[PDB]
Design a protein around this ligand. Structure first.
Ligand SMILES: *[C@@H]1O[C@H](CO)[C@@H](O[C@@H]2O[C@H](CO)[C@@H](O[C@@H]3O[C@H](CO)[C@@H](O)[C@H](O)[C@H]3NC(C)=O)[C@H](O)[C@H]2NC(C)=O)[C@H](O)[C@H]1NC(C)=O
Ligand code: NAG
Ligand code: NA
Ligand code: NA
Length: 442
């Protein structure tokens, strides 16, 4: 009753038929049936190929002549290791059927198309370790998660090959549209948050774990969210992976869920070691301050999820998507640039999309190296807003920007270079600027 997106049938274009396991052996049947467990296969851990009909793994003898067999996935006493690049050639050699490339049935994609992927456990006693697939529990083999032995229905898996022996397990990640049972829900935003305190995972592993849940590593986009996160941290002493990273080498600091980085909680001396230490953490010790750390260390992590044109203008301004834009060539401070924009019925430009950024960069800015745009923290330090009051829906920062937020109390934002990435600057730098205003529909 649980779906099997990674299960496939194995089709020999030479023998015109599917690989089937019954009796003790494996043969080709010209009759291909996608519903017959005996014909259904999946890659599992340690290069093993699992058959649903037998609940066993394909094998051949160690270096005594060849053949092919179905064996309990425990067995050291046969070679169960298969590599998807060579699997077809091996089936031809060991099958013995005298007459051809092997592919996945019906899509004809090659046998590497559905690799085994590790699935990180949630809670349990295993600190986040992936499911061991397959695993024995109470003398049955499981090729995936199961609700058996558990009456609340939740899917779980063993993190050891033998559960009766080691009793190590964890819950399996769910892709869900609600927050039930694994999440705290903020009543105000309907955002859901998961604090895996008992888990030790690298940033990439923790990223993958949140993705397996239909979620992402925590982003903190506003002061209320920081505050609500600190409230959930109360009573704990911990350092947890969050979504903040500079890993993209062309850009600056960013959230992996691509929220704007408009709000900054960095600790006083952070970020440091710009070379390595590419991934962010939240610390209870600073009550929610952020650090950048080496991405390969194993830490607890936090996951987050949400269950959620023609125009014209006055001369010297140019249309884009119902708005109008123009360059102010005169070099001025950010404050005086805004005043100049307001004298022409507009504000310093706000940028809500990459398309809008590209029009601005290529059509308006053109050869001008650096110029003021509307983003700034003047109202409340560390919290960036557009001067025109529209929402900040995305950021594009140059590498290691923004760096000016602690040393300049008044921190403003430019556009620099041909790609249209942003810098932050003390607001008193004298630069050209760009104005935006609402256009007139024709
Ligand atoms: C943008 O703002 C900056 C900071 O407000 C300006 O830099 C400041 O310039 C001041 C004047 O040069 C310095 O003040 C003091 O000036 C006397 C003059 O005789 C010197 O002796 C002092 O040494 C000097 N103060 C110190 C501590 O050395 C400020 O120190 C200096 N501040 C900084 C942080 O650099 C920029 O000039 C201003 N830019 C524009 C374009 O307006
Ligand atoms: C496949 O197997 C099922 C047995 O559940 C059988 O009812 C069905 O007719 C078979 N179909 C084909 C095309 O072999
Ligand atoms: Na650090
Ligand atoms: Na800067």
């Amino acid at each position: 009753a649980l779906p099997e997106p990674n299960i496939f049938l194995i089709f020999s274009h030479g023998l015109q038929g599917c690989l089937e396991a019954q009796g003790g052996q494996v043969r080709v049947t010209p009759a291909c049936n996608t519903s017959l467990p005996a014909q259904r296969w999946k890659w599992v851990s340690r290069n093993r190929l699992f058959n649903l009909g037998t609940m066993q793994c394909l094998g051949t003898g160690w270096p005594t002549t060849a053949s092919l067999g179905m064996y309990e996935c425990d067995r050291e006493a046969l070679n169960l290791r298969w590599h998807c690049r060579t699997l077809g050639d091996q089936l031809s050699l060991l099958l013995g059927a005298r007459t051809g490339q092997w592919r996945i049935y019906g899509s004809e994609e090659d046998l590497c198309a559905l690799p085994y992927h590790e699935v990180y456990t949630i809670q349990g006693n295993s600190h986040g370790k992936p499911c061991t697939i397959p695993f024995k529990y109470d003398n049955q083999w499981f090729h995936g998660c199961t609700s058996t032995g558990r009456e609340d229905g939740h899917l779980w898996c063993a993190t050891t090959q033998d559960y009766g022996k080691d009793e190590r397990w964890g819950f399996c990640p769910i892709k869900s549209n609600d927050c039930e049972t694994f999440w705290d829900k903020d009543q105000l935003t309907d955002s859901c948050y998961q604090f895996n305190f008992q888990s030790t995972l690298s940033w990439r592993e923790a990223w993958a774990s949140c993705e397996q849940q239909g979620a992402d590593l925590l982003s903190i986009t506003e002061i209320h969210e920081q505050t609500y996160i600190n409230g959930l941290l109360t009573g704990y002493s911990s350092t947890l992976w969050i979504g903040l990273n500079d890993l993209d080498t062309s850009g600056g600091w960013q959230w992996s869920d691509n929220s704007p980085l408009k709000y900054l909680n960095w600790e006083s001396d952070q970020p440091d070691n710009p070379s390595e230490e590419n991934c962010g953490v939240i610390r209870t010790e600073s009550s929610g301050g952020w650090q950048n750390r080496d991405c390969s260390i194993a830490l607890p992590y936090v996951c987050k999820k949400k269950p959620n044109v023609k125009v014209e203008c006055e001369p010297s301004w140019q249309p884009f998507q119902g708005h109008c834009y123009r360059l102010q060539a005169e070099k001025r401070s950010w404050q005086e640039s805004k005043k100049a924009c307001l004298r022409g019925g507009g504000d310093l430009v706000s940028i809500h999309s990459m398309a809008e950024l590209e029009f601005i960069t290529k059509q308006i800015k053109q050869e001008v190296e650096e110029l003021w745009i509307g983003l700034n923290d003047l109202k409340l330090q560390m919290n960036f807003e557009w001067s025109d009051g529209s929402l900040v829906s995305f950021t594009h920062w140059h590498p290691f920007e923004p760096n000016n937020f602690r040393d300049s109390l008044e921190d403003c934002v430019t556009i620099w270079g041909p790609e249209g990435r942003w810098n932050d600057s003390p607001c008193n730098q004298s630069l050209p600027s760009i104005c935006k205003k609402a256009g007139q529909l024709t």
